[PDB]
Write a protein that binds this DNA or RNA. Structure first.
Lengths: 54, 97, 78, 67, 83
DNA sequence: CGTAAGATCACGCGCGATATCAGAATCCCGGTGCCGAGGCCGCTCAATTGGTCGTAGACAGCTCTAGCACCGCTTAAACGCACGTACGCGCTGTCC
DNA sequence: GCGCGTACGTGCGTTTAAGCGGTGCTAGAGCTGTCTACGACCAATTGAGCGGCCTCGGCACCGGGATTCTGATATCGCGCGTGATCTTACG
């Protein structure tokens, strides 16, 4: 999955951000890594509706 | 001209959520850590790697906490996180009493 | 010292958290929560160091401290 | 007991139970639910309301790290 | 004998009583089904774990110790039944 | 014839969507450097094999105890309806 | 803060399956005696992963150009309000 992500981001070497993306985006891996914070991982893009402009 | 209040915030959210670089400048954070550490033992040294790990954990925890806080404030029909929101979040988490 | 966590930095963190509007008292409340979190983690890390009879806190000690607290961290020789 | 038996059945057929096991299950279930309701009431209060409502439960379970 | 719809055995008065022990005063109508769902989820998880332990044990009967092990697995340790 | 009420057209004003400028955002691409990545060579140090021992584990059989099932009995608990009242939702004014 | 709609509480009535007890059947749980397979270890052997040291490039950076996005404004459109003209009724 991380390689998949890296291809989507058009990169050749997997970097942490790719790992974080693969983990969090997938449901089962995210559940498995429920109590893990990945260095240089960041968060998945996500904006709550009511915050969005009208 | 002028951007309407509440727009540049959305841009910054898009901006920061796409990157992973730390958001607290290193040196003040490091000095805070050393100050805090001093109160448990004197004349202590830290591997820079250790400080980086501390910063990683702290920022990740804070981001999670704010995520929960925003969720609470939205539930309270609000758009501005307020201290009571963080208190409620931590309380439900079980961290605060 | 503690205040060295600059208000805009807290804003940046929150933004990465998805917050749009931030209150004044927030900043200080966040400072307090950060201080407590650091206190616990560093306490455990020192404890680990002391038992090792080392004057230098190691990353590994940080890692075990976080793992105790159920806040496992990756990327520092887990 | 009937609900528990049904649930186990769907996980595997032809299981029998020590009564004490059922009792422990019920104790843990009631404790979990009481705590959940406490957190729900807290959420309801934070939402300037007095009647707990389903969305309150979902918020509580989100913040708890439950899914 | 087949078992069906036993989730509704968790009657409204019982859920109300629990919510009372939780400090709740006024209960919205939809709360009951959501609570049923939550209970079903929690029970499914705990019974999955307990049955797993029993299977490894090669036993046809679930023992309290199995339940206690399952609960401790879920970070919900229980006192009063051994262990 | 002459005045008063109603319908329809012409004209004017108010609210909403959608064509235009314009400064800031974002992306793409030419050209360069680099520190990390990757492969090769040494070297320890680790994985494997001949063969031995007690040990764990398997199996079989004897004992039986709580598990299950059903019947009768009793009654606390569960479910349907009048209503009105506190609670929830929605609009509005203020100023933080 | 004000106003309006209403979800649901108490209470009553009715209805029912939840607990006790009483009997009866019995499943597999539990505890002895047999028998056997295998993992630690020593010798001795062999070979693979780690590190040092070379090599090379994916990507950051720079700079520039090209493509998009809010904020402001104005026109078309629709709907509401008023006066002129045609119609009908009464005097």
């Amino acid at each position: 999955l991380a390689g998949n992500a890296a291809r989507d981001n058009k990169k050749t070497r997997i970097i942490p951000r790719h790992l974080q993306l693969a983990v969090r985006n997938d449901e089962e891996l995210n559940k498995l890594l429920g109590r893990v914070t990945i260095a240089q991982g960041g968060v998945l893009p996500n904006i709550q509706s009511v915050l969005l402009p009208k | 001209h002028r951007y309407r209040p509440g727009t540049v915030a959305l841009r910054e959210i898009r901006r920061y959520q796409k990157s992973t670089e730390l958001l607290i400048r290193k040196l003040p954070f490091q000095r805070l850590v050393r100050e805090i550490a001093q109160d448990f033992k004197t004349d202590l040294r830290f591997q820079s790697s250790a400080v980086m790990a501390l910063q990683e954990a702290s920022e990740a925890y804070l981001v999670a906490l704010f995520e929960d806080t925003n969720l609470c404030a939205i539930h309270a029909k609000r758009v501005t996180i307020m201290p009571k929101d963080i208190q409620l979040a931590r309380r439900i988490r079980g961290e605060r009493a | 010292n503690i205040q060295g966590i600059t208000k805009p930095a807290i804003r940046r963190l929150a933004r990465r958290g998805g917050v749009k509007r931030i209150s004044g008292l927030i900043y200080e409340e966040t400072r307090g929560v950060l201080k407590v979190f650091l206190e616990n983690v560093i306490r455990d890390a020192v404890t680990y160091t002391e038992h090792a009879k080392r004057k230098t806190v190691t990353a590994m000690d940080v890692v075990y401290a976080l793992k105790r607290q159920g806040r496992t961290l990756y990327g520092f020789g887990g």
